[PDB]
Amino acid sequence: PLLKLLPLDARDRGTQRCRLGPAALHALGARLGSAVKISLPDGGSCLCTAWPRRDGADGFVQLDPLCASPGAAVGASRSRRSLSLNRLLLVPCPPLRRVAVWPVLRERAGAPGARNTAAVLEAAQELLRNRPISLGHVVVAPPGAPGLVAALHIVGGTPSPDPAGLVTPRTRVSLGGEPPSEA
Amino acid sequence: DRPLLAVQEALKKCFPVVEEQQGLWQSALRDCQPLLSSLSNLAEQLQAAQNLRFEDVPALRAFPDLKERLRRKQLVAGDIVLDKLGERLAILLKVRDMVSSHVERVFQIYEQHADTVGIDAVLQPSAVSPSVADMLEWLQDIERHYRKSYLKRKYLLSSIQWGDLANIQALPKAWDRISKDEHQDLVQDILLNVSFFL
Amino acid sequence: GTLTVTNLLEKVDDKIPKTFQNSLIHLGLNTMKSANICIGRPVLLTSLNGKQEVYTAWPMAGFPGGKVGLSEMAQKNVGVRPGDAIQVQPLVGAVLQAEEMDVALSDKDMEINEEELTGCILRKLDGKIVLPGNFLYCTFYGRPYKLQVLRVKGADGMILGAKCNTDTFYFISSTTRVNFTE
Amino acid sequence: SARKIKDNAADWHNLILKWETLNDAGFTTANNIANLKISLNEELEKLCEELQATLDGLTKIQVKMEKLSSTTKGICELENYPLFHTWPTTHFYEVSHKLLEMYRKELLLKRTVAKELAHTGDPDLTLSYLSMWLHQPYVESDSRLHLESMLLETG
C-alpha cells in the first residue's frame, strides 16, 4: 500500500515507540512491542518499537527516531513524504548477552576529567534498559534525561547484533570507548 | 480465551500494587519538604558565619576559640538532617524496584502468550474497560515515570557538599521543580481509567 | 443511536480524570453498552436541527439509561434543552493532530492579548476535537471568553471550514498554532 | 394564598442573609487576589476559580428569588377575582420587584468586578474594586426597612 507520515505528538515523542494502524500490523504480523527496522527515504535505516494506533485508524504511521542511523536523525521529522510498507521489516531480537559502547558526555561544562566512571556507567546502563538496539546506531538521550550520558554509539555486540538485539537487565555494558570511523 | 483471562488477571492483579505503592511514594515524598527547608536554613546560617572574622569585633574578642566551636556544631545539626533525607530516598528506591519487578512480570506473561491471541482480540475496547493494548502501554509508562523520577531525585540530592554554600541554598526550589515537571498525576488518571477493574 | 438529553451530576465527583475536566458527557454502563460506547473514547452528537459536536464519553455510574447528561455550553452549541432527544454515534473514523486553527472573538473586544490567550487555550483544552464554527470556553485569569471556529488545517494536508461518523476529525495538541482573524 | 405570601417574606429574609454571608467570603477571596497580585501563577488560578464558584452560588440565590418574584406576581394577578393588616397586596409585588431589580443589578456589578479583578494595573483601581465588592453600591438602605415593614405585616 502506501502510508502517510504525520508528525509526532508529545507523549510518544518522548519515548522510542512508533505507532501504526492495525492494517499494517496485521500485514507483517508482529504481536506488540516488537522491533521494526525502518528505512527512511533519505538514507540511513532506523529501528523502532511497535504499538497499535489509538483509534483503529488506517494507513498512517507516526514514528520516533530514537535508535537512528548516524546523522540521519532529523530526516525522520518535517515531511509529508509517503512510506511504502515494504520499507518496514520485522526483525528478530536476541537477548544480547553483553554489549559495549562509546559515549559522548553531556556538556556539564565546568568539571571534566576522570569522569567517575561509576556514574557514567550507571547512567548508561540505565538508558539502555530493555531497549532493542541494532549495531551501528546512535541512541540519543531523551530531553531532560537524568545523569550525564547523551549518546551511546553502538560498537561492541557479543552475539553479533547486526539485524538488531534486545539489551536485557542482565547484560554487561562494557564502556569500551572506541570512537569508530570518524570522518 | 484462557490467555485473555490470563493477561486480564495479570493486569487487574498488578494495578492495586501500583495504587498502594503510589500512596507510599507520595507520603514518603511529603516528608522530604520540611526537612529540605530546614536544611536550606542551616546552609544559610553557615553561609553567614564566614563573612565575619571573629578576631576583630569588640565583645566576641574575649571569647577565643569560638568560630570553630560553632561550625563544628552547625555541621552536625545539618548532617543529621541529611541522613534523614537519605533514609527517605531509600524508601523511594524500594518502591521503584517493587514496581519495576511487577511490571516486568506482566510483560513477560504477555510475551509468553502473544502468539495465540490475535492482536485484534488484544486491541478492542469494551464498554467498561480500555483496550488491553492501552493497559500494557500505561503500565510501561508508569514504570518509566517512576524510574526517571527516582534517578533524577538522586542525582540532585547526592550533589550536596558543605563547601558550595550557594548551591545548597537552592535545593528547596530545584527539588520542587523536579516534581512539577512530570505529567500531572499519571498514576492517578491511569488508576481512574482502570477503576472499572477489567 | 437515540437518547434523551438531560443535565449531568452537579458535583464533580472526583472519580473523574483530569485531561477530561471539560468535554464530558456522562452516561450509564447500560446505555454505554447499548450503543458500543467505550470508555475514554470520543463520540458524536447530532442535533435535531442539523448541528453536530463531538465529546469524550465517560461511563460515570449515575443516572440511568436514555439520559445523557451534557454540559451547559454543550447544550448551547448543540442548541437543545432538557428532555429533548439527540443522536449519539460511537466515533470510528480517523483522528489526527490539528496543525492550524483560526478563530475570531465574540467581540468582547478586550485589549487584544493574542499570544497571551493561546497559552491558556492549549493548556485548557488539549483533547477537545473541534469542527468548523463552534464555541470554546477558556477562562484566562478569571474573565470569560467565547471563540468561533473558522478553519482548521489538518496535518494530513486537509482543510475544514465532517458530518458523518466515519470521517476525519482533528484535535488540539500542544503544537497547534492559532490565528485570530474576523 | 396568603400563606404563600408569608413564606415569600420569610424566604426573602433568609435569602438576603445567605447573600451577605457569601459576599463576605468572596470579599476575603478578593483581598487574597489583590494582595497576591501586588506581590508581583496557578495558585492565583485556583483562587479565581473558587471566586467564580462563589459567584455561581450568588446566581443560584438570584434565580431562587426571581422565582419568588414570579410566584408573587402570579398571586397578585390571581387576586383579581383583604389580608392580615389591610395591605393592597399589589404593594407586595411592588416590594418584591424593587428588591429583585436592586439585587439583580448588584449581581451584574459583582460579575464585572470579578471579570476584571485578576489583571488590573494601578492599585487605585484595585481599591475601588474591592470597595465596589463590599459596599454593594446598588442596595438603597431603605430596602431592609421595606422588607422589615412587609415582614412585619406577617409576623
Supply φ then ψ for residue C63, to 5 degrees.
-65, 160
Which grid cell sits at C30?
447500560
Question: What's the Cα-to-Cα distance from D136 to each of C126, D58, D98, rounded to whole Å?
Answer: 39, 13, 16
- The nearest CA of chain C is from the CA of A98 a distance in Å of 40
Q: Length of chain A, please?
A: 183
Which residues, 6 or more positions from B63, have their beta carbon under 8 angstroms from its beta carbon?
none
Secondary structure (H, E, C), chain D: CHHHHHHHHHHHHHHHHHHHHHHHHHHHHHHHHHHHHHCCCHHHHHHHHHHHHHHHHHHHHHHHHHHHHHHHHHHHHHCCCCCCCCCCCHHHHHHHHHHHHHHHHHHHHHHHHHHHHCCCCCHHHHHHHHHHHHHCCCCCCHHHHHHHHHHHCCC
Measured CA to CA, the distance from residue A73 to residue A67 in angstroms comes to 9
Residue C60 three-state SS: coil
Query: Is A55's CB within 8 Å of C97's CB?
Result: no
Annotated binding residue D149: yes
- Residues A6 and A62: beta-carbon distance below 8 Å: yes
Q: What is the DSSP annotation of chain A?
A: --BB-----HHHHHSS-EEE-HHHHHHHT--SS-EEEEE-TTSSEEEEEEEE-TTS--SB-----SB--TT-SGGGSS----B-GGGEEE------SEEEEE--B---TT--SSTTHHHHHHHHHHHTSS-EE-SS--BPPPTT-SSSB---EEEEETT--SS-EE--TT-EEE---------
Measured CA to CA, the distance from residue A57 to residue A53 in angstroms comes to 6
Number of neighbours of residue C126 by Cβ within 10 angstroms: 15
**R_g over Cα of chain B:** 25
Size of interface C-D (CB pairs under 8 A): 20
Supply φ then ψ for residue B46, to 5 degrees.
-55, -30
Query: Is D48's CB within 8 Å of C144's CB?
Result: no
Measured CA to CA, the distance from residue A170 to residue D29 in angstroms comes to 57
Measured CA to CA, the distance from residue A161 to residue A93 in angstroms comes to 9
Question: What's the Cα-to-Cα distance from D62 to each of C150, D52, D100, D145, rounded to whole Å?
Answer: 36, 15, 8, 20
Q: Which residues of C touch D36 (CB under 8 A)?
A: none
| Distance from chain centroid for Cα B136 | 22
Measured CA to CA, the distance from residue A115 to residue A111 in angstroms comes to 9
Minimal Cα distance from B183: which residue of A?
Answer: A11
- The nearest CA of chain A is from the CA of B127 a distance in Å of 15
Strand partners, A90: A36
Q: Which residues of B touch C19 (CB under 8 A)?
A: 189
B123 near A CB under 8 A: yes
How many C-alpha atoms does C141 have within 13 Å on its Cβ side? 17
The single residue listed with the C-alpha cell 486553527 is C101
Amino acid (one-letter) located at C94 = A
Measured CA to CA, the distance from residue C162 to residue C151 in angstroms comes to 12
C92, C97, C156: residue with CB nearest A9:
C97
Strand partners, C42: C56
Backbone torsion region of residue A148, taken as left when φ is above 0, otherwise alpha when ψ lies between -120 and 50, otherwise beta: alpha
Query: Is A55's CB within 8 Å of C94's CB?
Result: yes
A31, A56, A126: residue with CB nearest B114:
A31
Query: Is B130's CB within 8 Å of C40's CB?
Result: yes
Question: What's the Cα-to-Cα distance from B32 to each of B19, B36, B170, B178, rounded to whole Å?
Answer: 21, 6, 15, 13
How many C-alpha atoms does C42 have within 13 Å on its Cβ side? 24
Which of A18, A32, A130 to mutate to probe the B interface, most B CBs <10 Å? A32
C17, C18, C33: residue with CB nearest B127:
C33
Residues 98-137, chain B, touching C (beta carbon < 8 A): 125-130
Which residues, 6 or more positions from B53, have their beta carbon under 8 angstroms from its beta carbon?
none
Q: Which residues of C touch B189 (CB under 8 A)?
A: 17-19
A52 near C CB under 8 A: no
Say which DSSP state B126 is in. Answer: B
Minimal Cα distance from B185: which residue of C?
Answer: C18
Number of neighbours of residue D72 by Cβ within 10 angstroms: 23
Which of B108, B132, B138, B155 to mutate to probe the A interface, most A CBs <10 Å? B155
C11 near D CB under 8 A: no
Instruction: Residue C53: name the closest of C34, C76, C85 by CA.
Output: C76
Measured CA to CA, the distance from residue B119 to residue B4 in angstroms comes to 11
- The nearest CA of chain A is from the CA of C94 a distance in Å of 5
Instruction: Residue B147: name the closest of A65, A175, A122, A117 by CA.
Output: A122
Measured CA to CA, the distance from residue C140 to residue C124 in angstroms comes to 9
Q: How was this structure determined?
A: cryo-EM
Query: Is C94's CB within 8 Å of A10's CB?
Result: no
| Distance from chain centroid for Cα B70 | 34
Q: In what order do the strands lie in the sheet with C85-90?
A: C24-26, C52-58, C42-46, C85-90, C2-7, C67-70
Query: Is C143's CB within 8 Å of D115's CB?
Result: yes
How many C-alpha atoms does D90 have within 13 Å on its Cβ side? 3
> Touch between chain A and chain D (3+ CB pairs, < 8 Å)?
no
Instruction: Residue A61: name the closest of A74, A48, A71, A45 by CA.
Output: A48
Measured CA to CA, the distance from residue D143 to residue D136 in angstroms comes to 13
D85 near C CB under 8 A: no
